[PDB]
Amino acid sequence: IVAKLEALHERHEEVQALLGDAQTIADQERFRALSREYAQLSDVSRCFTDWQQVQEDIETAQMMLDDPEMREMAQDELREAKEKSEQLEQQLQVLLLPKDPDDERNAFLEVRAGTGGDEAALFAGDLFRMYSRYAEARRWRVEIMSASEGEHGGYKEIIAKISGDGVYGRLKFESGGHRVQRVPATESQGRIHTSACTVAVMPELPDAELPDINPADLRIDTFRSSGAGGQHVNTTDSAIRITHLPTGIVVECQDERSQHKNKAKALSVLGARIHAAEMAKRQQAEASTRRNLLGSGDRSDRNRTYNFPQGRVTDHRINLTLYRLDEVMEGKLDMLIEPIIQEHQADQLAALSE
RNA sequence: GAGACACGGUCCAGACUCCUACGGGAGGCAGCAGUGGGGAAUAUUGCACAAUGGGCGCAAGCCUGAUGCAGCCAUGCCGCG
RNA sequence: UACCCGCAGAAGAAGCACCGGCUAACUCCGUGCCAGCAGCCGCGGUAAUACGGAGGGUGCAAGCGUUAAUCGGAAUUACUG
RNA sequence: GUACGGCCGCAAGGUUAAAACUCAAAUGAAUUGACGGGGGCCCGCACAAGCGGUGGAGCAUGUGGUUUAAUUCGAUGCAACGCGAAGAACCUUACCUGGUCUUGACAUCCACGGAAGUUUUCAGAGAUGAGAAUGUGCCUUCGGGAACCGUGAGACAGGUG
RNA sequence: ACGACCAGGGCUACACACGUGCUACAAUGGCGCAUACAAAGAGAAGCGACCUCGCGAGAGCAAGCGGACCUCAUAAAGUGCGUCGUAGUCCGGAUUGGAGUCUGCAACUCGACUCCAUGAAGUCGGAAUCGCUAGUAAUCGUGGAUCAGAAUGCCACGGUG
RNA sequence: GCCCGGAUAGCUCAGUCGGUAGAGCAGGGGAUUGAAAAUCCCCGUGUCCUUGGUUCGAUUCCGAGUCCGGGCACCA
RNA sequence: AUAUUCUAA
RNA sequence: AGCGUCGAGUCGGCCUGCGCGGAAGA
RNA sequence: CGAUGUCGGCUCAUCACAUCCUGGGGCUGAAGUAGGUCCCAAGGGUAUGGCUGUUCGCCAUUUAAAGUGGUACGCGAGCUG
Ligand SMILES: [Mg+2]
Ligand SMILES: [Mg+2]
Ligand SMILES: [Mg+2]
Ligand SMILES: [Mg+2]
Ligand SMILES: [Mg+2]
Ligand SMILES: [Mg+2]
Ligand SMILES: [Mg+2]
Ligand SMILES: [Mg+2]
Ligand SMILES: [Mg+2]
Ligand SMILES: [Mg+2]
Ligand SMILES: [Mg+2]
Ligand SMILES: [Mg+2]
Ligand SMILES: [Mg+2]
Ligand SMILES: [Mg+2]
Ligand SMILES: [Mg+2]
Ligand SMILES: [Mg+2]
Ligand SMILES: [Mg+2]
Ligand SMILES: [Mg+2]
Ligand SMILES: [Mg+2]
Ligand SMILES: [Mg+2]
Ligand SMILES: [Mg+2]
Ligand SMILES: [Mg+2]
Ligand SMILES: [Mg+2]
Ligand SMILES: [Mg+2]
Ligand SMILES: [Mg+2]
Ligand SMILES: [Mg+2]
Ligand SMILES: [Mg+2]
Ligand SMILES: [Mg+2]
Ligand SMILES: [Mg+2]
Ligand SMILES: [Mg+2]
Ligand SMILES: [Mg+2]
Ligand SMILES: [Mg+2]
Ligand SMILES: [Mg+2]
Ligand SMILES: [Mg+2]
Ligand SMILES: [Mg+2]
Ligand SMILES: [Mg+2]
Ligand SMILES: [Mg+2]
Ligand SMILES: [Mg+2]
Ligand SMILES: [Mg+2]
C-alpha cells in the first residue's frame, strides 16, 4: 500500500520535465495523454509528501530535549501532530475514492451455492443477507428477480438487482468464490465442513433498444418467383430478397403472389432476425462475463474465507485478516471493501498508459 | 581373380550433391578424425610405426587411422588424499 | 615415462540425499486443505517430528540424489514351486 | 464375458475373446457390536383407563427475529427458551455515546518528598483539577524507621479479549 | 488500549414467530356481613407490636425480641346468612386519565404499592400437545433466598382432596 | 394484410352476459419430524389485457387498440 | 392399506 | 467603391411587366 | 376472348445516358501512389465457370471494365422446351 504510493513519486518527476520548454510540444497528441496523467496523480502526490514529512519526525519525537523528564510533556505536541497525520490518511481515502462513471451504475448481485450442497445453500443465504443489510444501510434499493431456495434453507441461487448511486463501484470486488468453514446446520456429528458460494456482481447494461431498420442499410432485389402460377408467375416481379448491409443478414420471400405482401413479410422477418441476432450476442457476452466472475464453485477458487470457529474473515487478494466476522455477517462490509478499493486505485493511477 | 558377385573396383538404373564452355562430366565416412542434423546422451579435424601384427620386397626398406600411444568425459570399477 | 630422492608449508583439496511409518536419523519458527510434499500408506483446513527455513541428527562420500531399464523380493504363471 | 474379427443362428442372440483407461483395493470366512417395517421375553404415567392442563384471550416472562448508537455475553432437538440471573432505575454492567487516564482502578520492588486523617470553597455532568484552613501522632539506638498517602521510573500490573 | 475512571444512555427497543407461566371466560360462581381449623420459615443499619393519624398504600409515636418468650402474622379454600339470576352480567380486570405512598443521591427512559375513574380481549380454545397412579392430581392460602426497592419465577410449607 | 377464438390470483384454468368473482397447484403462519418431504390445521391472493363510450352502475354490453393462439390470403 | 430421504473435514 | 486621401451621386427593400437557371430516355 | 404464343437459355441485335472502362475537367478531410465526390463525354469496349429451369443471387477465378435501362422486360412464321 505504502510501496505503491512510492511508485507515484517515481511517475511524478519524469512527467514533470517539460513546462515551457521544447521537446513534447511538437505533437499535442502524445502531450494530451501525459498532461492529464499528471493532474490525476498530482493531488495524491502532494498529500503523500505531507505524510512523508510526519513519519521521520517520530524517530526524533521520543526525546527532543535530551534527558527523560519533559520528553512526555513534549511528546503530547507530537501526539497531536500524529492525530493530524491520521486525518491525512483519512483524506488519502477520498483522493483515491474512484471517479469513473462506470462505478455509479446499478448492479445485479448473483449468489450461487458452490461445493457443500445444503450447507453451501445456507451460506448463500448468509451472504445474500450480509449484502442486503449492507445495501439498506447506505440506503440502496435491493429487489429479487430470481430465487431458488435450498431444501434446509438458504438459496441454490439468488439474483437481486441493487439500485442506487455508486453500487457497482463498491460491489465489483464481491465477484468470485467465498469459502465458509464452520459446523453446518445439516451436520449430525459436529464436524467442521468447508463449503463455498460463487458471487457474480454484473453492472446494469443500458436495457436494449431494438433499433429501426434504416432503408438506406437495405439492398432490395425484386425478381420472378419460382414454380406454378401460369402467365402471371412467368411475367411478374413478385419475389423479394432484402439484404441488410450492416449485419449481412439476407431474407428471401416469395410466399405470396403480390410483391407488396412479400416485401412486407420480408421486412418483418429481417426485423425479427436482426433483433434475435443482437439479443443472442448480449446473452453470449453476459454468459461469458458471468462464467469468468463466478469461477468454479470449488473450495480452492476463492477471494475470501469466513472461518466461524476462529471468527476470522480473510480477503486473500489483499492478504488481510480481521477477527470481526460477526460484524461482517451483519453487513458492515466497509471493513473489507475500503482496503480493496484503496489498492485497486493505487494500481490504476500507477499503470494507466504503461 | 585361388578367392568377390568386391566399403575406399567396373557397368546400368535411381535419388541426392558438385563441376560445365550446356555438348557433357564427377561423387558415396556403416575406415580414422571431424562437420551439420536427429537426440535425454556419447570424445581429438592429436603422435608414432619404437612394440605386436599385416601387404609388397632377396633384403634394406616402403606402406599400414590395424595397432601402440596421447587428448577429452566422475561413464564405471579400484586405490589414495 | 614408471619409480626414486630433495625443497617449502596444513599448506592447494567435501559434497549430496535423507530424518511420519515402512527406514538409520527430532526439535523450533513460518504457513493455515494455501503454499507445497508424496514410492506406498498418507501429510497440510491457525499448537504440522510429513510443507518451507533453521539448529541438531542419520546415511553415503568425490561423489550423492533423481529418472529410465532388467532380474529380485513375487510360491504373483508355481519344472523345481 | 464387452468391443473388434471368426464361426454358428430366421432372429433373439450364442460361442471364441481383447485393449486403452481407471482404482488401491475388490474379495472369502469368521468376531464384537449396532441396527431390522426379524423372533422370543421383560420394564417405565410408554400406551391404555381416568382427572386436570397447554395450543385460542389478556397479561408476566424467556427466546428467535427485527430494530437500535447500544439493544453486553452465554444456553439452541429430547438434554436451550421464568435457562447462567437466588431478583438490570443508578450501582450491578461486561454494551453504546461523549468526557478523561497511561507503570496505571488493582500488586510487588526502588529513589525522592511528606504522619495519617480532618473540615471548607470554587470550576466541572462527573471523573478530575485548582485553592484555603487543619493537624505533624505512633516505634525510637532521639541516628532511624513503619502506619498510609502523593511525584518520577521500568521490571510489570491489567483484559467478562 | 481489547487496560482504567466518569456522566448519560442501553440490556425494558417492537410489523412479527415460539416456549414457560399467571388471570380469566363465571352460579361447584361473584359481591357483602359473620365466623372456624395449619404447617413451615425469617428477623439487629433487622422484624417491628400497641396507641394515634390517613378511605388506602402508608405516616407518627414507640414496647418487645439475636427469639418454643417478641415481631413478621389476619391462613385461605371452608362454614352460616344475605344478595346477584345466566347477562359480556354485580362475570373478567386488560388498558388509559387523575391523585398519592414508599424505597432510594435519583423512580423520564424504567420500580412496587394505594385511591378515584376507566372497564379491553375473553362465553372453555384448530391441527396438535403436556402432567399425574394417592395424601398424588386438582384446588386453597403460608413462608424463604436474592434483595434499598423491585415475583405470576424459583425453593420450601401446610389445608381440602 | 384480413378473419375466428382468447386475455380472470404467483402458474394452469372455471365462472358471470349489468350490481354482490371461484378452483387446483403455488404463497404465508402454525402443527407433525432429530431434520427435510409427504400429511394435518389456519390464513391471505385479484384495478377480471389496455383504452374511449353506453349506463345510476361494466369483469360482464358496445367501439377501438395491444398481446397470444388458430384459420385464410383463392380462380387463374 | 399407506412409512421417501439424510451431501461434503 | 478603392487605397485620413479622393469629388457625385450611392445603398437595398416594396409594387409590378417580360425573360434566365432549376430541365435526364430510349 | 370468330386467339395479340406466355419464363429462362440460344442466335441476332438496336437505341437511351441516369457512364462500368477508356478520354477531358472542378472540389477534396487531393503530399505521392491510390481514392472520394460532382461536371463534360455514348467513339469503341464492357468475363469464363460451379450451383439452380431459373431471372435473381451466392461462390471460384479473371478483366481496363465485367454499366443501368428501353425495344410486346426486343428476338418461338429464328432455335430450345
Ligand atoms: Mg575393395
Ligand atoms: Mg568410404
Ligand atoms: Mg565419422
Ligand atoms: Mg540436438
Ligand atoms: Mg599413405
Ligand atoms: Mg527410526
Ligand atoms: Mg525399477
Ligand atoms: Mg518368480
Ligand atoms: Mg458377447
Ligand atoms: Mg463374436
Ligand atoms: Mg393416555
Ligand atoms: Mg396462549
Ligand atoms: Mg441474547
Ligand atoms: Mg451462542
Ligand atoms: Mg465467550
Ligand atoms: Mg458455545
Ligand atoms: Mg446500568
Ligand atoms: Mg471513552
Ligand atoms: Mg454508568
Ligand atoms: Mg434480558
Ligand atoms: Mg368483578
Ligand atoms: Mg432474611
Ligand atoms: Mg367478544
Ligand atoms: Mg356466559
Ligand atoms: Mg409411578
Ligand atoms: Mg400457589
Ligand atoms: Mg425481597
Ligand atoms: Mg399442597
Ligand atoms: Mg432426493
Ligand atoms: Mg422557367
Ligand atoms: Mg381474326
Ligand atoms: Mg451525362
Ligand atoms: Mg452519335
Ligand atoms: Mg471521330
Ligand atoms: Mg454463375
Ligand atoms: Mg430482356
Ligand atoms: Mg419478351
Ligand atoms: Mg422462347
Ligand atoms: Mg416472332
Side-chain angles (χ1 to χ4, degrees), chain A residues 39-250:
Chain A
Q40 293 181 0
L41 66 92
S42 179
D43 191 9
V44 176
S45 180
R46 291 190 298 241
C47 177
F48 190 65
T49 305
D50 296 0
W51 189 57
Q52 288 286 359
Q53 192 69 7
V54 176
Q55 288 292 118
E56 64 183 359
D57 297 359
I58 303 173
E59 282 64 61
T60 63
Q62 294 180 0
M63 277 188 321
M64 169 172 212
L65 204 306
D66 277 355
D67 300 1
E69 203 284 346
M70 279 295 314
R71 59 175 290 184
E72 293 185 357
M73 273 291 210
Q75 196 279 299
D76 291 301
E77 190 178 1
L78 284 310
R79 193 269 292 184
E80 186 63 60
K82 204 279 182 298
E83 287 290 302
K84 287 181 178 181
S85 63
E86 194 281 302
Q87 295 180 0
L88 293 176
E89 292 181 0
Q90 187 64 241
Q91 284 183 359
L92 208 309
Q93 298 286 117
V94 175
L95 270 70
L96 288 185
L97 251 299
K99 217 298 87 171
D100 185 58
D102 187 62
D103 293 295
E104 277 62 62
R105 72 204 298 196
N106 293 343
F108 279 75
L109 174 91
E110 318 189 21
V111 170
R112 287 182 183 73
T115 176
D118 293 343
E119 162 53 11
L122 281 182
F123 176 63
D126 302 309
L127 281 188
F128 178 57
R129 183 189 171 260
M130 163 198 323
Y131 292 134
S132 291
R133 294 187 101 287
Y134 179 71
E136 79 91 1
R138 292 175 78 80
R139 207 99 296 175
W140 300 339
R141 200 78 288 287
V142 43
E143 68 104 12
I144 302 176
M145 356 294 302
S146 192
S148 184
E149 283 176 353
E151 294 292 351
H152 293 252
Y155 302 115
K156 282 295 151 189
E157 185 176 6
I158 189 79
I159 306 168
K161 187 177 182 181
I162 305 174
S163 307
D165 188 9
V167 172
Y168 186 63
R170 299 199 70 71
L171 298 194
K172 86 171 75 76
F173 300 112
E174 294 312 295
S175 290
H178 296 250
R179 184 177 61 153
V180 55
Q181 297 178 310
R182 62 189 183 190
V183 178
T186 48
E187 214 301 296
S188 184
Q189 329 302 355
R191 291 144 67 221
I192 309 180
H193 278 286
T194 301
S195 296
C197 292
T198 71
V199 161
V201 162
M202 287 160 97
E204 197 188 358
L205 196 77
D207 45 7
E209 47 270 357
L210 297 185
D212 64 301
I213 309 153
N214 175 227
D217 296 353
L218 296 187
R219 194 194 67 179
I220 297 185
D221 296 306
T222 60
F223 46 99
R224 319 277 203 227
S225 185
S226 52
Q231 278 185 104
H232 186 251
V233 82
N234 295 358
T235 63
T236 320
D237 280 14
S238 274
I240 292 286
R241 185 199 338 282
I242 306 179
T243 316
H244 187 234
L245 274 78
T247 62
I249 301 171
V250 5

Side-chain angles (χ1 to χ4, degrees), chain A residues 274-303:
Chain A
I274 285 165
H275 298 134
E278 71 177 0
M279 261 198 322
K281 289 176 188 176
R282 288 181 186 248
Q283 283 177 5
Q284 289 176 7
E286 185 186 4
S288 80
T289 299
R290 179 156 46 239
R291 196 168 306 126
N292 295 4
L293 286 193
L294 289 193
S296 189
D298 287 351
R299 55 177 65 74
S300 72
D301 302 301
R302 53 200 152 77
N303 298 308

